[PDB]
């Protein structure tokens, strides 16, 4: 909340956040690329995370290649079964790797 | 040129009509028999397969493109006959319009 020019910061116990993990792969798959955000090398570092986007098909309009496709998919998000949490409760999954080889 | 390739394939299958000789002469020759009796065959044939496929499961929010008709009123509708009996392909079709993620 901001007064006049200064902060106060409070805490609210009802609010929640929403997550989910996406296992089948559905949405546009942006890691593997070497982007930054991630857990800091080392464990006293507090850190901020960074904000999910993607793009997708562009297409040769007059003077513009920027301009969309037929084909140019839009995916919402909330249209995923996500999970909401408040303070207490917490959230968890498992993952097990197909057989590679060794490096 | 697109397909699937395979290993064993499915069987050719080969048919012939079974020679049948004309009139030989009485006097014995043992020259092969040149002339025979002209004639051909004709029937019916069935090809029955099972394919298999693969279920699209995909959350984007828009629609899609797709397979549709022209959408002009056309002299002749399309993958139809003409006047004359004659059946016609107006256009070729490709199974790629469902998009998916890279």
């Given at each position: 909340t901001t007064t006049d020019g200064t902060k106060t910061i409070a805490n609210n116990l009802t609010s929640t956040v929403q997550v989910f993990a996406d296992t089948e792969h559905q949405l546009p798959y942006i890691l593997g690329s070497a982007h930054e955000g991630c857990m800091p090398p080392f464990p006293a570092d507090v850190f901020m995370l960074p904000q999910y986007g993607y793009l997708t098909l562009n297409g040769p309009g007059s003077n513009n290649n920027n301009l969309s496709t037929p084909s140019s998919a839009f995916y919402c998000l909330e249209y995923f079964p996500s999970q909401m949490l408040?303070?207490?409760n917490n959230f968890v999954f498992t993952y097990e790797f197909e057989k590679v080889p060794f490096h | 040129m697109g397909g699937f390739g395979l290993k064993?394939?499915?069987p050719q299958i080969l048919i012939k009509n079974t020679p049948v000789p004309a009139d030989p002469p009485t006097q014995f020759s043992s020259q092969k028999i040149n002339s025979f009796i002209t004639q051909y065959s004709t029937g019916q044939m069935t090809v029955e397969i099972e394919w298999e496929?693969?279920?699209?499961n995909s959350k984007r929010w828009n629609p899609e493109?797709?397979?549709t008709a022209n959408f002009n009123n056309s002299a002749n509708a399309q993958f139809s006959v003409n006047n004359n009996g004659l059946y016609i392909e107006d256009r070729t079709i490709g199974t790629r319009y469902l998009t998916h993620t890279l």
């Open positions: 408040r303070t207490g | 064993n394939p499915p496929l693969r279920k699209e493109i797709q397979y």
